[PDB]
């Protein structure tokens, strides 16, 4: 129960009378109850790395012994909540303390125990029914958007002996009671899970469904899959805000978990100011994405343990909402800062410095964290299937992808959306460079595309090859100029420009292409590639004649068609329904076919 | 309030460098302050570096020279280092540990604040927004500082970063289209530069705003460690309680890092990267991040840490972690310094992430962003044209190239080149920028929207 | 097939014993049950990193890049459990798959693995990016038992000469590419053009291969000969005239 502080040197506190303590357990040191992690044991002397500043912690101070490791506290109240990396509810600490600082050793519960929740038990469950870990034994109306399914913890099972009637309950109320081998377990609406322990699932299915974002470049050229693993460069003008906002507002992800993991103070202030104001249209009503989002936000002056465990807290919350049956999108703002916190912990423990000073396990930690992303058959009786898509961003030193953190992240992840400050300056938004980006889920999504969007795969391959050919010809243009380019080279260049400026380029502020449905995206790409193929066919088949066609001839004859191709962006998905947009694109293709037939 | 009498111990078990290891201590407190009397009566202060069992390792601020067992007494004050803070310490010169060195009285506390402070709540911090004008054109019209930003100055040994710091202290203020204050902390600053700072602030009539903490190079390095915390505790008191916009200028974070390295070695911690502590990132974050706007309070703390990049290596741990924690950089160029331009601020490698929040209508003016962007573009093009002229010759250059060279010369002679005592309001800075932009015709100013060119280009 | 699995989320130290479990099973199946066992140890980089973690915890003497001073001996305990044995008709063939950190063949893991094992098959990022499958770079690849596994009797008698000549011509083609990056096309002599054509056709017809295409050794040697025939006999200096006369003309 109670230890005592036998010594204090920096953040390391050696506690006596700690015979029963467990390795990597959590302890409240001092009279202010500073959080601390047992990092060593020697007889009764347990060494503790104290998260908060140890100034004023005097010998003889009691050391309360929490019977758990660093464990997130799951249950209603997560949604719309701003936590620290340690699950400290900043938004509740500020309200209760009426201060701009975080009091040393603040012990505010992660989830409010006073707020009441409308809880409806599973109708089938009774007294005596067999229940198993992962079973949804109730549903709580947390929001008009997210129904929080209260479910049994893993490692728990038995026969229900009391299930509460529908009503208003708090996180401290006992909503269920079960028995196994005579041992009786009373379960409230809140459970606790170690952050560093993977939440079990009945099976980890392959990722076979897109994580649509609405950005044409991301959805079409470089698709990510629900349960995917993605990386994003972190720079000043890169534009990661567009990716975060798209995933938060328009993506099919049922839940969003944004982990700052040690950002600058003002950067985190910007995130905390912007995310609450973002709104999404669900069921015709403009709700707030914070009805379904949670923010594990912490700055660079927070406890290093909090910064290093922010990623684990975020992934554990994402896994919880996945098991609930949802599709969650976790977004680490900069895993580089988490890796810096990890290196700092290694230095504090005086562990051997591995490659470029990072710990001897950086790759293992990153791989194990990214392994928690995926699509699973959620554990429990109600057949569910959730997912956790990690979009953790990394910060390459000066644009170099060779540092240990970026190298490990690129090796582990399967998508890299490669935002570019160069394109940001050129005003090509989104700034995805579409040359260093990549996606390894194309072979996984082949089945989905063939079922729903049959032609999209050849369209995307042709677009990618067009862009590659344009990149290769960019050098030839310098050597011999544009006048020396063949007609096929000219058509490739002038459709590559069309794709760059009119397909990849997309403005998130306009009401018509802030969110681009995949049907619209594939329609635009199909029209562009049809133009390219038919122009190339005309050029090749008139190369043999004296009246050979040229790109100049085609442009002069069909300036209207090129204008319409450029204006395909301006079709509003909302006002111009799917049927209307598809019909208009089909009419456009008819016009192109008529014009090309007349010209040829 | 602590009413119990302080305990004085003559139980000195051993002395090792700066450490007096006392024994038989009654419930030793970590970070406790302890005043020790030497055999001959000399009084020194110290901090309980490490606590174990009944022992207490007391790092003595001054050296251990002359300390002995069996005669040296040590009275444990019973509390961690708490500083007395008030508004009246605005217009005072204190040493590293807070003792006045202006022949004034000791601070009559309005409060007793712990120097280590607590981390400002991220949910209570607010985006800095408006601009703090430093009077220097090269960092007003090109690297403006927002109210709440942390923007360091990078420089090397010998460059005039301390002179720039004193100029910023003398000239800093709100845009003004008595709620502003400056907290100058100087660490590891030789007697000459300390006297320069003190006398300059006293003479130029700005001392009414400036609280000056001086830690001379030969003063205790533990005092150097606690100097920035004293300065930022005073800044937090003045900003988040007295509600006045505070600019904290911390000089020689490299010297602070040297003091931190010394304290780590005294603690017997193994050197980390490049011989520095592994937690130096956390320490620098603890210092810097005590800044910014907050919710429900009208004050703020802008920070301008000044670094001496050792060997002019931007990859050195101190500047690297400072760039990781802060939100910009103002580079002091040895090339410009040798060319005798003052301030020798390079605007190409410099940056201020929150310039867009610092500038704009109602904060500085409508055309600030466009003028700054066009000035940067023209300056880069001018450097490129100079490089090209170095190869092709003056004749081979075109009229646009000659215009760019002319703008480069006049931009380094009128915009950058300022003079130590030339206080330019941001409006004067923008007027100079427009004088330089009017070298070119309206067409080559492609980065200034026509809406702004039609209004500000004429005349 | 017998699978021992230790995924990323599984315990780190258990990777220190997974290879030994697999190799003990292989040894039982080969030297006691007389099977021919192909042992495949995937992510020997992960195994070595787990070993480094344990060594760091023990504060053992570190080698290059922090790995324990005995990493060579440990990797040898793993790898040297291969090969045939007298009086027993079994065998254990090992194909560890290890990821070179930062594509650095001089990183301690690949370096010590090359020192211990009897060769290496070098998968090339440049070839993979160019979309050449398998992206194998024969120049840094090596096989220490080819010299005896090829020749007359086993496979064909021109095998060694063809392999050596392909190595030499491929290396000279790479050198010609490097010089061409500097001096441009117009400064290349006819021999350099011959070598560049050989390099192109070698990477397109010899290295490049279907993922399910099973070329016999004779087919591979025939491809090698049709590639070597680019040069005149006098430019093939590795192959003795006796071999060239018999095999070149066809």
């Amino acid at each position: 129960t109670f230890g005592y502080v036998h010594g204090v040197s920096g953040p390391v506190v050696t506690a006596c009378d700690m015979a029963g303590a467990a390795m990597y357990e959590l302890v409240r040191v001092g009279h202010s109850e500073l959080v601390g992690e047992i990092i060593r044991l020697e007889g009764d002397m347990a060494t503790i790395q104290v998260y908060e500043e140890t100034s004023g912690v005097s010998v003889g101070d009691p050391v309360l012994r929490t019977g758990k490791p660093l464990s997130v506290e799951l249950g209603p109240g997560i949604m719309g909540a701003i936590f620290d990396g340690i699950q400290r509810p900043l938004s509740d600490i500020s309200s209760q303390t009426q201060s701009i600082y975080i009091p040393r050793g603040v012990n505010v519960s992660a989830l409010s125990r006073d707020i009441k929740w409308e809880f409806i038990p599973s109708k089938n469950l009774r007294v005596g029914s067999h229940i198993t870990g992962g079973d949804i034994y109730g549903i709580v109306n947390e929001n008009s958007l997210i129904k929080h399914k209260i479910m049994l913890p893993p490692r728990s099972r038995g026969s229900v002996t009391y299930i509460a009637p529908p009503g208003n309950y708090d996180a401290s109320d006992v909503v269920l009671e079960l028995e196994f081998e005579g041992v009786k377990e009373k379960l409230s609406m809140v459970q606790v899970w170690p952050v560093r322990q993977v939440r079990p699932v009945t099976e980890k299915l392959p990722a076979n469904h897109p994580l649509l974002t609405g950005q044409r470049v991301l959805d079409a050229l470089f698709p990510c899959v629900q349960g995917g693993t993605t990386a994003i460069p972190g720079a000043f003008g890169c534009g990661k805000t567009v990716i975060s906002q798209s995933l938060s507002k328009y993506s099919n992800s049922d839940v969003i978990i944004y982990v700052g993991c040690g950002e600058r103070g003002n950067e985190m202030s910007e995130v905390l100011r912007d995310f609450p104001e973002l709104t999404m249209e669900v069921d015709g009503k403009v709700e707030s994405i914070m009805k379904r989002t949670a923010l594990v936000a912490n700055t660079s002056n927070m406890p290093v343990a909090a910064r290093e465990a922010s990623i684990y807290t975020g992934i554990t919350l994402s896994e919880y909402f996945r098991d609930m049956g949802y599709h969650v999108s976790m977004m680490a703002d900069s895993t580089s800062r988490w890796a810096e916190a990890l290196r700092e912990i290694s230095g504090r423990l005086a562990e051997m410095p591995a490659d470029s000073g990072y710990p001897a396990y950086l790759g293992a930690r990153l791989a194990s964290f990214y392994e928690r992303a995926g699509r699973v058959k959620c554990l429990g009786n109600p057949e569910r299937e959730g997912s956790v898509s990690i979009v953790g961003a990394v910060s390459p030193p000066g644009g170099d992808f060779s540092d240990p953190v970026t190298s490990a992240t690129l090796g582990i992840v399967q998508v890299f959306w490669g935002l570019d400050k160069k394109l940001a300056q050129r005003k090509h938004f989104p700034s995805v460079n579409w040359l260093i980006s990549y996606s390894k889920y194309m072979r996984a999504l082949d089945e989905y595309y063939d079922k729903h969007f049959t032609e999209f795969v050849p369209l995307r391959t042709k677009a990618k090859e067009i862009l590659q050919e344009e990149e290769d010809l960019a050098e030839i243009v310098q050597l011999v100029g544009k006048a020396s380019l063949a007609e096929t080279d000219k058509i490739t260049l002038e459709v590559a420009k069309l794709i760059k400026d009119d397909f990849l380029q997309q403005n998130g502020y306009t009401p018509y292409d802030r969110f681009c449905p995949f049907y619209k995206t594939v329609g635009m790409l199909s029209n562009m590639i049809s133009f390219y193929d038919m122009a190339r066919r005309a050029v090749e088949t008139t190369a043999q004649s004296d009246n050979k066609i040229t790109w100049s001839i085609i442009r002069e004859h069909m300036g209207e068609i090129l204008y319409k191709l450029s204006s395909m962006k301006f079709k509003d998905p909302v006002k111009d329904g799917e049927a209307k947009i598809k019909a208009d694109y089909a009419q456009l293709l008819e016009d192109m076919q008529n014009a090309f037939r007349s010209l040829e | 309030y602590l009413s119990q009498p302080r305990l004085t111990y003559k139980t000195v078990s051993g002395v090792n460098g700066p450490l007096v290891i006392l024994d038989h201590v009654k419930f030793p407190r970590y970070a406790e302050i302890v005043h020790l009397t030497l055999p001959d009566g000399t009084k020194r202060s110290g901090q309980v570096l490490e606590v174990s069992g009944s022992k207490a390792v007391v790092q003595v601020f001054e050296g251990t020279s002359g300390i002995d067992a069996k005669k040296t007494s040590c009275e444990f004050t019973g509390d961690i280092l708490r500083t007395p803070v008030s508004e009246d310490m605005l217009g005072r010169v204190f040493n590293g540990s807070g003792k006045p060195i202006d022949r004034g009285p000791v601070v009559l506390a309005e409060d007793f604040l712990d120097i280590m402070g607590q981390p400002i709540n991220p949910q209570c911090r607010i985006y800095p927004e408006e601009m703090i004008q430093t009077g220097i054109s090269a960092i007003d019209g090109m690297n403006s500082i927002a109210r709440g930003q942390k923007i360091p100055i990078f420089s090397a040994a010998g460059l005039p970063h301390n002179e720039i710091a004193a100029q910023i202290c003398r000239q800093a203020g709100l845009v003004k289209k008595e709620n502003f204050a400056i907290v100058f902390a100087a660490m590891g600053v030789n007697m000459e530069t300390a006297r320069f700072f003190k006398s300059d602030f006293e003479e130029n009539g700005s001392m009414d705003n400036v609280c000056l903490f001086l830690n001379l190079a030969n003063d205790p390095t533990i005092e150097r460690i606690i100097t920035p915390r004293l300065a930022l505790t005073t800044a937090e008191f003045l900003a988040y309680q007295c509600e006045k916009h505070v600019l904290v200028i911390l000089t020689d974070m490299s010297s602070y890092a040297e003091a931190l390295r010394e304290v780590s070695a005294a603690r017997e911690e193994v050197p980390g990267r490049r011989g520095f502590p592994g937690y130096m990132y956390t320490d620098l974050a603890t210092i810097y991040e005590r800044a910014g706007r907050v919710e429900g309070r009208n004050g703020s703390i802008t920070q301008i840490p000044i670094l001496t990049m050792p060997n002019d290596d931007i990859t050195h741990p101190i500047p690297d972690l400072t760039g990781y924690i802060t939100e910009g950089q103002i580079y002091v160029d040895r090339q410009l310094h040798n060319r005798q331009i003052y301030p020798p601020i390079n605007v190409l490698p410099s940056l201020s992430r929150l310039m867009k929040s610092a500038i704009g209508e109602g904060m500085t003016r409508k055309d600030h962003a466009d003028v700054s962007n066009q000035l940067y573009a023209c300056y880069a093009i001018g450097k490129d044209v100079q490089a090209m002229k170095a190869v092709v010759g003056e004749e081979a250059l075109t009229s646009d190239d000659l215009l760019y060279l002319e703008f480069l010369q006049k931009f380094e002679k009128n915009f950058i080149t300022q003079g130590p005592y030339e206080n330019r309001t941001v409006y004067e800075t923008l007027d100079i920028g427009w004088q330089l932009l009017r070298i070119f015709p309206k067409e080559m100013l492609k980065r200034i929207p026509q809406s702004t060119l039609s209004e500000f280009y004429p005349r | 097939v017998c699978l021992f699995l230790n995924l990323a989320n599984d315990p780190t130290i258990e990777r220190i014993i997974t290879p030994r479990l697999a190799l003990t099973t292989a040894e039982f199946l080969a030297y006691q049950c007389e099977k021919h066992v192909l042992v495949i140890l995937t992510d020997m980089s992960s195994y070595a990193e787990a070993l480094r973690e344990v060594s760091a915890a023990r504060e053992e003497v570190p080698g290059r890049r922090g790995f324990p001073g005995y990493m060579y001996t440990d990797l040898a305990t793993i790898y040297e459990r291969a090969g045939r044995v007298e009086g027993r008709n079994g065998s254990i063939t090992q194909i560890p798959i290890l990821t070179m950190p930062n594509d650095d063949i001089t990183h301690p893991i690949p370096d010590l693995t090359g020192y211990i094992t009897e060769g290496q098959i070098y998968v090339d990022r440049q070839l993979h990016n160019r979309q050449i499958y398998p992206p194998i770079n024969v120049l840094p690849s090596l096989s220490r038992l080819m010299k005896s596994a090829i020749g007359e009797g086993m496979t064909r008698k021109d095998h060694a000469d063809v392999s050596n000549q392909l190595y030499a011509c491929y290396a000279i083609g790479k050198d010609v590419q490097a010089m061409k990056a500097v001096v441009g096309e117009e400064a290349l002599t006819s021999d350099d053009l011959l070598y560049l054509e050989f390099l192109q056709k070698f990477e397109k017809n010899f290295i490049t291969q279907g993922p399910y295409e099973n070329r016999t050794v004779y087919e591979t040697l025939d491809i090698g000969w049709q590639l070597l025939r680019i040069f005149p006999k006098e430019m093939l200096k590795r192959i003795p005239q006796s071999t060239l006369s018999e095999f070149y003309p066809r």
Binding site: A350, M352, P353 | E268, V270, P271 | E59, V61, P62
Partner: peptide, 19 residues
């Protein structure tokens, strides 16, 4: 770093021996 860590470990062992 390895040398300094080894020296620190030896110093700790020697202190224990003296105690």
């Amino acid at each position: 770093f390895y040398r300094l860590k080894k020296i620190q470990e030896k110093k700790k062992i020697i202190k224990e021996k003296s105690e």
